[PDB]
């Protein structure tokens, strides 16, 4: 029946709640709370290393990010368990946010770094370890490649955190490689 397990579900709820807060309070008021630490005095507010992934600035990217999260996140949770999804999510949110702030500073957000990690993870784990029962469909490979391309060449309305995305993708591929060593 239900495709989305507890972790898949709770992330989606978190993103919706944060999105609603941003419409009520405005993007900036919520960023000040949830953004990657933008000053040394904030460096021990440990939630900020992750909560950047919960903010979205447009209707299109929250929808697309949550669609991919629901599908890939959902597939990982179902087949490999809630723990595996939690770890891919925390590690990719941390390292994608690191790389992004490093090159472009701290004013960014969105779940797409995590989504790209899931794309990479599901693809490579499926390739190298098909008995895992996970697999990235050809159609979704094509979809993801175009979305990446669109990001890189600024084809959306909006300024893109290409650091976070590509770093996300590298994290997912790395974790899948390690997970399938055997």
């Amino acid at each position: 029946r239900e495709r989305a397990g507890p972790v898949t579900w709770v992330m989606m709820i978190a993103c919706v709640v944060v999105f609603i807060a941003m419409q009520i309070l405005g993007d900036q008021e919520v960023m000040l709370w949830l953004a990657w630490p933008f000053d040394p005095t904030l460096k021990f507010e440990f939630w900020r290393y992750f909560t950047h992934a919960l903010m979205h600035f447009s209707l299109m990217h929250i929808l697309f990010n949550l669609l991919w999260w629901w599908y890939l996140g959902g597939a990982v949770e179902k087949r490999l368990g809630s723990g595996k999804l939690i770890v891919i999510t925390l590690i990719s949110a941390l390292l994608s946010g690191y790389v992004q702030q490093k090159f472009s500073g701290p004013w960014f957000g969105g779940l797409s770094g995590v989504v790209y990690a899931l794309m990479g993870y599901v693809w490579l784990r499926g390739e190298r370890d098909p008995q895992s029962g996970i697999y990235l469909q050809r159609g979704l490979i094509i979809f993801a490649l175009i979305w990446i391309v669109a990001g890189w060449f600024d084809l959306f309305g909006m300024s893109m955190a290409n650091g976070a995305h590509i770093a996300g993708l590298a994290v997912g591929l790395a974790m899948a490689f390690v997970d399938s060593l055997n």
């Binding site: 992004q100 960014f108 909006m158 976070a164």
Partner: peptide, 4 residues
């Protein structure tokens, strides 16, 4: 603000 950049989006991921």
């Amino acid at each position: 603000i950049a989006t991921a």
